[PDB]
Design a protein around this ligand. Structure first.
Ligand SMILES: COCCCc1nc(-c2ccc(F)cc2)c(-c2ccnc3c2CC(c2ccccc2)=N3)[nH]1
Ligand SMILES: COCCCc1nc(-c2ccc(F)cc2)c(-c2ccnc3c2CC(c2ccccc2)=N3)[nH]1
Ligand SMILES: [Cl-]
Ligand SMILES: [Cl-]
Lengths: 299, 314
C-alpha cells in the first residue's frame, strides 16, 4: 500500500541498458528525489508491451502484490511509473544475474557458494509459496546476485501480468497448469544450471520435443560435480506426479545440511582455493552493499 | 579486528574529488573485489600527515577503534590502506555533509527535520561517550546525511590521531576549530565528553541558523577572551527560548554543569513531539517528514540498516 511508490517520469532517467528478457528491457537508471541534487542508481525495467493489454487498475493491483514481497531472497518491487508504458523500479544489483555469474566464474566457484545459493533460492521460493504466490518463471537468469554470498529471486509476477519450455513442469507444457509444485520443477532445473556452471538445459534438443522426452522418462543428466545426493533432489523435482515432488521447506533443510559439509556433496577440482569470505570480507561486503538483515550463511 | 579490512592499492581506485577538510581530502572511489568485474562505489579519505611520527601500527590500532563503532548515527570505518599515505574507506553517502545540506536547503527545512537531527546527533555522541571515545571535532561539517531523515557522525578521533602542531593561534585557516571548542580545550587542550557537549551546542546553533558561521567577524585569536567575559553565540531567530537555553547550558564555563548527551536525547526528543512549539519557521506545515510511502522507498534504496524511528509530531 505504502509499499509501492508511484513515480513520475521526471524524477528518474535511464542512462544505460543492462539487458533484456522476454518481458522488457532492463536499464541502469538514476532516481532524482525532488528538491535534491543527488542521483541514486536504480534498476528500471520497461515492459515489452501488451500481449493482451491489461487494464491500468489490474496493472497496479499486481504491482502492489509485487511490492509487498518482503524476504531477503526475493526482489521487492519498489516503484512503478505508469505512462504510455510500464516501468518497474527496484534496487540495483551491480553483480547482475546468477546465471552470468556462475558462467564467468566457471571452475573457480567453491562448493560452499553453490550449495548456499541453493539454500537461498529455496528460502525465497518457500516465502512465495507461504504467500500463495506462483512464480511461473524460476530459472537462473531470474536469480540476481546482490553479493556473491547473497542472491535474490527476481521477476516474480511478470509472467502472469504479461515460453521457457525447457524449464517447465510437464503439466505446464501440456495444460498450462502452474502451481507451487511446478515451481519446484523449475527449481530443480535452476539448480541443474548452477551445478553445471550455467549449461543450457537440453542443449540442442528442440523445444517441440521436450514433452516427448519427459513422458519417455528421460531427464537432465547428473552434473559432473554432483554426488548422487544432489542429483536425486533434482530428479525428485522432476517427477511426473507433481505431488511427489519435494517441498521448498524440505529443500531448505536438505541443502542446508549439505552446505555444512560442502565438499562431501560436491566434487570440484580446485575446491582447495575457493571458500566463503572471511568474517572481515563478509563485514566489508555487507557494510558497503548489503545492510538488510538476512539469516547467516551455512558454514 | 575482523572489523577493519586492510586494503591494498591494487583493490581500489580514487575516481573523483568530493571535498577537503582539516584532516584530509575526500574522494569518490571504486572498490574492485579480488576476482570480480564490478566496481563498488566507496568514500575514500586520504589523511594529511600526522603531526608526530606515529608507529604506523599505532595508526592501525586507532583505526581498529574507528571500525568498531556500531550505531545507526555514527559512521563506521570499513577499511584502511597504509602506503604512501594513510587512506580511509567507508560507505559513500551521496548527500554529503549536514552543513552543506542546511545551507542549500535553507527555507525548505521544517522544524521536524531540525529537531530530529539534534536527537540523532545526540544519540551518536551518546554512543561515542558510552564507548569512552571523545570526538574532539564535532561540527555540522562532520555530520553526514545518509538520507534527509537519517544523519550520522563522522571523523571522530581523527583530531587525536593527527594532532595540530599549535595552529591554535592562527586566524581561521587553521586546522583547529577554535570557534567550536570549549574554553578549557582552547586554554589547556583538555578534551572530554563535556567539551564534546559544548561543540554539540555550536552544532545545534549551526543547524538552527541554517549554516551560519559561528562568531563571524570575531577573530579566532579573540575567542577565549570573549568567552571569558560571558559572550556567547546569539539566539537564532527560529529558536524559542526553550531551545536557546539548552544551547547556553552547553556553553557553561563549568564543564560538569553542561548537559549530558543522554539528557539532550530526551530533551530534543520531547521537543520533536511538538515541533511547532519549540521552533517557529514560516511555512512549517508544508515541510513535514516523508510520508510512509516515500521513507519506505528511501530505505529500500539507500538506507537498509536498522535505525531508531524518527520522532513524529504528536
Ligand atoms: C538480462 O537481464 C535482464 C532481465 C532479468 C532482470 N530483470 C531485472 C529487473 C529490473 C527492475 C525491475 F523493477 C524488475 C526486474 C533485473 C535487474 C534488477 C535489479 N538489479 C540488476 C538487474 C540486472 C542487473 C545487471 C545486468 C547485467 C550487468 C550488471 C547488472 N542489475 N534483471
Ligand atoms: C563532505 O564532507 C565534509 C568533509 C568531511 C568528510 N570526511 C568524510 C570521510 C570519507 C572517508 C572516510 F574513511 C572517513 C571520513 C566524508 C564523507 C564520508 C562518506 N561519504 C561522503 C563523504 C563526503 C561526501 C560528499 C562530499 C561532497 C558532495 C557529495 C558527497 N560523501 N566527509
Ligand atoms: Cl525480462
Ligand atoms: Cl576533514
Amino acid at each position: 500500500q505504502a509499499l509501492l511508490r508511484i513515480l513520475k517520469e521526471t524524477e528518474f532517467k535511464k542512462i544505460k541498458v543492462l539487458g533484456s528478457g522476454a518481458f522488457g528491457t532492463v536499464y541502469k537508471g538514476l532516481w532524482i528525489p525532488e528538491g535534491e541534487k543527488v542521483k541514486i542508481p536504480v534498476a528500471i525495467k520497461e515492459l515489452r508491451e501488451a500481449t493482451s493489454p491489461k487494464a491500468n487498475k489490474e496493472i497496479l493491483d499486481e504491482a502492489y502484490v509485487m511490492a509487498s514481497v518482503d524476504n531477503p531472497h526475493v526482489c521487492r518491487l519498489l516503484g512503478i511509473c505508469l505512462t504510455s508504458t510500464v516501468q518497474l523500479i527496484m534496487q540495483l544489483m551491480p553483480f547482475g544475474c546468477l546465471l552470468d555469474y556462475v558462467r564467468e566464474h566457471k571452475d573457480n566457484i567453491g562448493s560452499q557458494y553453490l550449495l548456499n545459493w541453493c539454500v537461498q533460492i529455496a528460502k525465497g521460493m518457500n516465502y512465495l509459496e507461504d504467500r500463495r504466490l506462483v512464480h511461473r518463471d524460476l530459472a537462473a537468469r531470474n536469480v540476481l546476485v546482490k553479493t556473491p554470498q547473497h542472491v535474490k529471486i527476481t521477476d516474480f509476477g511478470l509472467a502472469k501480468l504479461l515460453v521457457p519450455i525447457k524449464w517447465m513442469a510437464l503439466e505446464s507444457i501440456l495444460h498450462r497448469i502452474y502451481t507451487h509444485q511446478s515451481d519446484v520443477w523449475s527449481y530443480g532445473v535452476t539448480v541443474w544450471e548452477l551445478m553445471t556452471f550455467g549449461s543450457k538445459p537440453y542443449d540442442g534438443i528442440p523445444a517441440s520435443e521436450i514433452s516427448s522426452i519427459l513422458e519417455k522418462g528421460e531427464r537432465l543428466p547428473q552434473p559432473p560435480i554432483c554426488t548422487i545426493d544432489v542429483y536425486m533432489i533434482m530428479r525428485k523435482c522432476w517427477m511426473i506426479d507433481a505431488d511427489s515432488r519435494p517441498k521448498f521447506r524440505e529443500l531448505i533443510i536438505e541443502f542446508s545440511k549439505m552446505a555444512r559439509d560442502p565438499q562431501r556433496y560436491l566434487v570440484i577440482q580446485g575446491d582447495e582455493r575457493m571458500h566463503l569470505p572471511s568474517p572481515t570480507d563478509s563485514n566489508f561486503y555487507r557494510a558497503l552493499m548489503d545492510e538488510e538483515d538476512m539469516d547467516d550463511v551455512v558454514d
